[PDB]
Design an enzyme around this catalytic site. Structure first.
Site, PDB file in Angstrom:
ATOM      1  N   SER A  60      -1.208  54.553  65.748  1.00 11.69           N
ATOM      2  CA  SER A  60       0.190  54.568  66.235  1.00 11.69           C
ATOM      3  C   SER A  60       0.629  55.798  67.034  1.00 11.69           C
ATOM      4  CB  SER A  60       1.169  54.404  65.083  1.00 11.69           C
ATOM      5  OG  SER A  60       1.300  53.028  64.748  1.00 11.69           O
ATOM      6  N   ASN A  94       4.874  47.179  65.054  1.00 14.26           N
ATOM      7  CA  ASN A  94       3.980  47.091  66.211  1.00 14.26           C
ATOM      8  C   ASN A  94       4.472  46.008  67.188  1.00 14.26           C
ATOM      9  OD1 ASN A  94       2.312  49.190  65.250  1.00 14.26           O
ATOM     10  ND2 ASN A  94       1.038  47.773  64.080  1.00 14.26           N
TER      11      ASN A  94
HETATM   12  C1  LIG Z   1       0.496  52.497  63.269  1.00 11.53           C
HETATM   13  N1  LIG Z   1      -0.203  53.555  62.807  1.00 11.53           N
HETATM   14  N2  LIG Z   1      -0.811  53.184  61.593  1.00 11.53           N
HETATM   15  C2  LIG Z   1      -0.457  51.917  61.326  1.00 11.53           C
HETATM   16  C3  LIG Z   1      -0.768  50.940  60.251  1.00 11.53           C
HETATM   17  N3  LIG Z   1      -0.704  49.809  61.138  1.00 11.53           N
HETATM   18  C4  LIG Z   1      -1.659  49.110  61.724  1.00 11.53           C
HETATM   19  O1  LIG Z   1      -1.296  48.249  62.501  1.00 11.53           O
HETATM   20  O2  LIG Z   1      -3.085  49.238  61.482  1.00 11.53           O
HETATM   21  C5  LIG Z   1      -3.991  48.601  62.396  1.00 11.53           C
HETATM   22  C6  LIG Z   1      -3.623  47.127  62.608  1.00 11.53           C
HETATM   23  C7  LIG Z   1      -5.412  48.623  61.866  1.00 11.53           C
HETATM   24  C8  LIG Z   1      -3.938  49.409  63.692  1.00 11.53           C
HETATM   25  C9  LIG Z   1       0.410  50.768  59.282  1.00 11.53           C
HETATM   26  C10 LIG Z   1       1.376  51.949  59.215  1.00 11.53           C
HETATM   27  C11 LIG Z   1      -0.069  50.423  57.874  1.00 11.53           C
HETATM   28  O3  LIG Z   1       0.345  51.400  62.315  1.00 11.53           O
END
Ligand SMILES: *c1nnc([C@H](NC(=O)OC(C)(C)C)C(C)C)o1
Length: 358
Positions: A61, A149
């Site tokens: 992220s 997301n």
């Molecule tokens: C943004 N940063 N970390 C995350 C985790 N989300 C996420 O989408 O993980 C994948 C799909 C593997 C990139 C979240 C905070 C649990 O999202």
């Protein structure tokens, strides 16, 4: 690195890597505007490849910060306005609940409950359209912030429409290139695979899987050197010669909404400096960071505040990253690891380092 930096870095990161059993780690400290680097461990355990200053990590992220700045750049170019309806740039989205949902709402997670993930079943163009078409909000637009997301990912896909370029072409051309981020990729090319760290989840080597709007939401890979440069560029946006990029960065750090002591920018999140460390450390736990919270509008948005702690956490299955900087102090940190370990441990360690050097 100045011995002051060596001392706190070593005292802080060594215990962290041990407590969290992190396979490999790179850290950059930006001190008085200049980058200083540190690496530990293995990018690839099986092949005994060390982490180096050329190792690519998945940013997770932290990718949202690039997306936010690219959107800010398109605003500065006059291609989009955050006050514009989502449907202006997606005429096929005819669902009536979208009325009143603007690009701001999408960028800052305030659309009314767009979910944390685009569902894994959403693969194609048709699937994507049907997902947003059939989505029903939990709340009115601009009332609740719910980290998603699916929200900022859509923002990024739409922000690049008037340019004629794909999200990837626009990111390369308008952000990576002007900033000389020559080892930062949305898609890692074959020649670079030698440098692409493996992620580790329950002892298993893993890489992020493709999914809808991944590039926009969580899909960037970069080295510790490029990530330091990114910090330098966000610390001091006025050194940037490309005018709309300079503005874009400023726009990504404006304060659009408040929840508690935190302000939502584009990708970036901000708090006033000096900060309560417990507040940023505890607030980084996904139990808090991923829950819905009421927002107050900042009308009109406060332009980038130099006395801020500006930050973003990021993760994938097998990686854990963190970026934080204080423009007023010309001070920043990048922490990149190939294990997804708890967020409060990252923020805790970053605060210890930055507080000692401040
Ligand atoms: C943004 N940063 N970390 C995350 C985790 N989300 C996420 O989408 O993980 C994948 C799909 C593997 C990139 C979240 C905070 C649990 O999202």
């Amino acid at each position: 690195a100045p011995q002051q930096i060596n001392d706190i870095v070593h005292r802080t990161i060594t215990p962290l890597i041990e407590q969290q059993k992190i396979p490999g780690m790179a850290v950059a400290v930006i001190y008085q505007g200049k980058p200083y680097y540190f690496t530990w461990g293995y990018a690839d355990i099986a092949k005994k490849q060390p982490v180096t200053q050329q190792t690519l990590f998945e940013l997770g992220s932290v990718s949202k910060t690039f997306t936010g700045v690219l959107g800010g750049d398109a605003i500065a170019r006059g291609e989009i306005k955050l006050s514009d309806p989502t449907t202006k740039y997606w005429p096929e989205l005819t669902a009536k609940q979208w009325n009143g949902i603007t690009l701001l709402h999408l960028a800052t997670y305030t659309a009314g409950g767009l979910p944390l993930q685009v569902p894994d079943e959403v693969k194609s163009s048709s699937d994507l359209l049907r997902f947003y078409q059939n989505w029903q909000p939990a709340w009115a637009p601009g009332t609740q912030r719910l980290y998603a997301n699916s929200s900022i990912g859509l923002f990024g896909a739409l922000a690049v429409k008037p340019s004629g370029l794909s999200f990837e072409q626009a990111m390369q051309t308008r952000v990576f290139q002007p900033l000389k981020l020559n080892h930062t990729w949305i898609n890692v090319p074959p020649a670079e695979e030698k440098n692409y760290a493996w992620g580790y989840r329950e002892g298993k080597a893993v890489h992020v899987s493709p999914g809808a709007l991944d590039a926009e939401a969580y899909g960037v890979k970069s080295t510790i050197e490029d990530m330091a440069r990114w910090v330098q560029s966000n610390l001091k946006p006025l050194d940037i010669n490309e005018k709309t990029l300079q503005q874009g960065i400023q726009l990504a750090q404006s304060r659009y909404w408040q929840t508690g002591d935190m302000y939502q920018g584009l990708g970036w999140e901000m708090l006033d400096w000096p900060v309560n460390p417990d507040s940023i450390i505890n607030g980084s736990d996904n139990k808090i960071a991923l829950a819905a919270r009421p927002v107050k509008a900042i009308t009109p948005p406060t332009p980038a505040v130099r006395a801020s702690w500006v930050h973003k956490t990021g993760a994938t299955g097998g990686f854990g990253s963190y970026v934080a900087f204080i423009p007023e102090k010309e001070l920043g940190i990048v922490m990149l690891a190939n294990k997804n370990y708890p967020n409060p441990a990252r923020v805790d360690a970053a605060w210890q380092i930055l507080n000692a050097l401040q």
